[PDB]
Design a protein around this nucleic acid. Structure first.
Lengths: 77, 50, 225, 53
RNA sequence: GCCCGGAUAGCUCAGUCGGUAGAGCAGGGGAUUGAAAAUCCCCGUGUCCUUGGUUCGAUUCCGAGUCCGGGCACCA
RNA sequence: AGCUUGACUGCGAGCGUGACGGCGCGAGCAGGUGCGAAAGCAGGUCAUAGUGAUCCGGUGGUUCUGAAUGGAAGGGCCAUC
RNA sequence: UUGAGCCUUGAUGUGUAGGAUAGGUGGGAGGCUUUGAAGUGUGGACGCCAGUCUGCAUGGAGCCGACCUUGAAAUACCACCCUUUAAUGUUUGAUGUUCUAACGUUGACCCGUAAUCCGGGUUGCGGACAGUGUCUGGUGGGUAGUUUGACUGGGGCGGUC
RNA sequence: GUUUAUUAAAAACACAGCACUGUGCAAACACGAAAGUGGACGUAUACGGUGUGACGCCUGCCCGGUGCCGGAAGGUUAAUUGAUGGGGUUAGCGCAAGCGAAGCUCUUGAUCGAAGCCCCGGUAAACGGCGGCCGUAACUAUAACGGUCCUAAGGUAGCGA
RNA sequence: CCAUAGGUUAAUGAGGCGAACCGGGGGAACUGAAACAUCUAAGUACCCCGAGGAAAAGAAAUCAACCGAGAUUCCCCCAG
């Protein structure tokens, strides 16, 4: 499933509001990108499919801080 | 059509103005006539013409 | 292109700097190294369309300290207006019937003034005054019944300003010998004038760029405001 | 981001300084190898001690 | 509604950073051949769409307007 | 033809015609004007067709309202597109 | 490396009368040259090869202005700028190449594992492209929701409102 | 041969063949939000779409419109970027009319900006078109032929109630 | 190489069913507007996930207006 393994973001439903205001169900597929992150405390390329914003969150907190939140909620990497 | 629509504005400090029409074809000159004004309550000059 | 006498004063001015009316008057006095009392000039790029009658900046202004130069005035009146023109201070006062004589050899003046009831005689053959900015016109303030006053203001230091068909305007505002403060009052006297002569349809910044300069000198950016 | 450098590196060499580098050059080659480190305020003071001491 | 371009002789059109506005088609005639063909040349019936501004001078350059051509904009 | 702007503004007893909406006529009254010496006349044109409801907006005027207060935005009213 | 704006710096303008390849408005009867000028002799260069500018240098101590003309007068000098054009720089963008550390790999190899999947690792080849997400313009009966009036000697056509 | 099982078995459809065109592999295309799979465990003598329909003689004229395949000076142009101008609020200054810094906010919308469209050059075994009015060949008639109608060109062969 | 992936064994728990109510992710049409697309139908029908005995919500960056009230939920007014 196209769901960020960090921010938890996932495809949200919406509507294609055209000029004439014609409702049309759609979706906002998150900008996920399988990136290979390296951990100095494990010496491994932990690949995680996260969105664009999901990566920045890993920059501030830290790849180690993010993974710590994964193993906490059952997330396996 | 053709005969455009104008509006004579009060030459006074008032914002009042009368509406009418004219012949821009052979009457391009600026129209001007003295009419009554409900604001100042006095016949003031009315110019402005398309 | 330029000479040392000119390259020396160029280093006294910052091309990329907008001096103030108070800092320009003092610096200008140092931009006149010529062997004669140079005159102060101020040009500005009016943000108007010179090719539109409803957007022409023309008129006259009286300097608070004159121009610092003699202005031989020549007025052409008729009737009693002849005496009022002479006793006014006019250098030369010729009648309407003797307007041709002036064209012969008696043509020595800086400005010409006339009366409305005498514009039909001077109007013609004005091919010698028109191209020389000496052709009297009710706009430049050189054509009015009170010629006695008009001439007095001119002799006092009144200068006329008219934007060219390009969008630029330049007029004298005195000499360089004048004190700093003195020049300031004169410069501002003109700046406030153009703003008063600004056309109603004029869009955008009326004052795009102002700069002062002498006879044998460079220009200096100055904030009109 | 800012981040501090550990190695020498090219146009930013100093063996220790804060330079505004794009998040692309840092989180991809600099840090993910051993030439830079995110200025989480906890490191700027850490390496700061190395300077004096 | 905004913007660019076009409107030139009777017709189809070329043209200029501001000034005697030309060509082709058609018609009359001429030249040339011994002659009929062809070919070439001469001859023009214009407020350069309309109203202003600058200029000694506007088909030109600028502003407004009309018709027309192209695109976009166009929720009482 | 001369002089000019009544093609003016606030009302209008009463009356005509329509299911209604709406439309039409109206002497006269108050204020302010034009013409004539004056008496008077003028609320467009001899009269009858020359037309576009509402909603949604723009512009000018009016402190009427102003979601805590003082303003403003917006809205309402009059004129108008 | 370069297309365009911007700012200084230098060029730059062949209606006609005419000493002559006059930009328009202004200041302006003198600045300029011994901080070494005209006038000759070359290079570079613009270009309607008409003519002119300039570094160097020879030389060495002048060159000018209403001039009588021109609608409009100075390479006599100096400003605010335009037309045209060139070179630094500045600013906003564009183009292509190189590199590798993301990313792609339905190349090879190893292990999980006597397994054509998959995952990890190694290596090679590409490479910040490709691809994808969001926004946006165009395209779009492939597809979907509907409209396509009423009077009317039945309706349609015509005509009408 | 196939087809409307159950009123049409036919000139319809299919057909080998031929032609145009797309496709360089992770192919085009198709089924799917994705993964994946089919196409093909194939590689241009392949495959998909379209058209025609053994064979024999042959397959003309026309590129304006509508499409497709390219190029391109200039013009217009989205998102985004947010230059100026105007307005609201208010410290202060005004004895009052009024104006009004900084900040904040509302509004107005230069500049940056690729395709696309137009324009230009081709393509008709692409969708289609291949007609009107006159003058003429010295018996009639007709028209080899010559203009025009500006819509692109205006019927070759053969055949023909 | 270390370290992991992986493999084996053991303990515990989970899986399913179920009338309604509840929270959340999905989310029409018919119909009405006497047509019809904005709108309405409706966040209803239905599909799917999870939990309890209630669920959900819940202890103010809420209202009020210069006087105060003081979590949430439910009912009656406010008010068609």
């Amino acid at each position: 499933s196209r769901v960020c393994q960090v921010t938890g973001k996932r495809p949200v439903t919406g509507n294609n509001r055209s000029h004439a205001l014609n409702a049309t169900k759609r979706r906002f597929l998150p900008n996920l990108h399988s990136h290979r992150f390296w951990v100095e405390s494990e010496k491994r390329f932990v690949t995680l499919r996260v969105s664009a914003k999901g990566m920045r969150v890993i920059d501030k907190k830290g790849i180690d801080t993010v993974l710590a939140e994964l193993r906490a909620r059952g997330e396996k990497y | 059509g053709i005969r455009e629509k104008i509006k004579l504005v009060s030459s006074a400090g008032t914002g009042h103005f009368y509406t009418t029409t004219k012949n821009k074809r052979t009457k391009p000159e600026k129209l001007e006539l003295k009419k009554f004004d409900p604001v100042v309550r006095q016949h003031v000059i009315y110019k402005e013409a398309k | 292109k330029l000479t040392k006498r000119m390259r020396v004063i160029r280093e006294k001015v910052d091309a990329t700097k907008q001096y103030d009316i108070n800092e320009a008057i003092a610096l200008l006095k140092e931009l006149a190294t010529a062997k004669f009392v140079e005159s102060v000039d101020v040009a500005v790029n009016l943000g108007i369309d010179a090719r539109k009658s409803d957007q022409n900046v023309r008129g006259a202004t009286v300097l608070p300290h004159g121009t610092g130069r003699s202005v031989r005035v020549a007025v052409f009146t008729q009737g009693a207006n002849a005496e009022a023109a002479k006793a006014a201070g006019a250098e030369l006062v010729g009648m309407e019937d003797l307007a041709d004589q002036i064209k012969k050899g008696e043509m020595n003046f800086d400005v010409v003034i006339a009366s409305p009831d005498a514009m039909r005689v001077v109007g013609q053959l004005g091919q010698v005054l028109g191209p020389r900015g000496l052709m009297p016109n009710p706009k430049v303030g050189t054509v009015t019944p009170n010629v006695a006053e008009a001439v007095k203001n001119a002799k006092a230091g009144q200068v006329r300003y008219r934007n060219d068909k390009n969008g630029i305007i330049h007029t004298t505002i005195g000499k360089v010998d004048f004190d700093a403060d003195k020049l300031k009052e004169n410069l501002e006297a003109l700046l406030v004038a153009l703003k008063k002569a600004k056309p109603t349809q004029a869009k955008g910044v009326y004052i795009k760029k102002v700069s002062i300069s002498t006879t044998m000198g460079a220009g200096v950016a100055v904030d009109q405001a | 981001m800012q981040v501090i450098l550990l190695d020498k590196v090219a146009n930013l060499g100093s063996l220790g300084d804060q330079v505004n580098v794009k998040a692309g050059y840092a989180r991809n080659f600099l840090v993910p190898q051993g030439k830079a480190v995110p200025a989480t305020k906890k490191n700027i003071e850490f390496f700061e001690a190395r300077r004096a001491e």
